[PDB]
Amino acid sequence: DLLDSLGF
Amino acid sequence: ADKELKFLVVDDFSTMRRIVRNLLKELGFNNVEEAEDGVDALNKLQAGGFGFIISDWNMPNMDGLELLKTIRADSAMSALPVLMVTAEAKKENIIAAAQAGASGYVVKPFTAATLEEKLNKIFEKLGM
Ligand SMILES: [Mg+2]
Known about the structure:
The complex is a heterodimer.
Chain A (H helix, E strand, L loop, with lengths): L1 H4 L3
Chain B lengths: L6 E4 L3 H13 L5 E4 L2 H8 L6 E5 L7 H10 L8 E5 L4 H9 L4 E4 L4 H15 L2
Parallel strand pairs in B: 1-2, 1-3, 3-4, 4-5
Helix pairs in contact in B: 2-3
The complex binds magnesium ion.
PDB class: signaling protein
Keywords: chemotaxis, chey-chez peptide complex, signaling protein
Assembly: dimeric
């Protein structure tokens, strides 16, 4: 979930 | 993004350096230079010219995280794209790297397909 939200 | 763009591939291991180097060639990016740690990197960065950093995370002297932080605190280099490479997609890292203004993130080992994503992502965020 983290990676995405960060534009990663 | 422009193909003549100057890359700096930073990693303590030369094989990783050569892998990234060739992957970049495949995607049509031929202007690449290398460094073995953050201090080596910073020393070459100060010659000017560079438009993108791909940095390893774990390096003696000055790890990638410290390097990234130095780039961001540097008046001339503050905006430079920096893709962080890591051996593990550890939540804490992804955060750490976000906090420090990492443009992007990638886990090794990684394929050319995977690299093309990350670069393009970076290019569209910043307008390259
Ligand atoms: Mg390393």
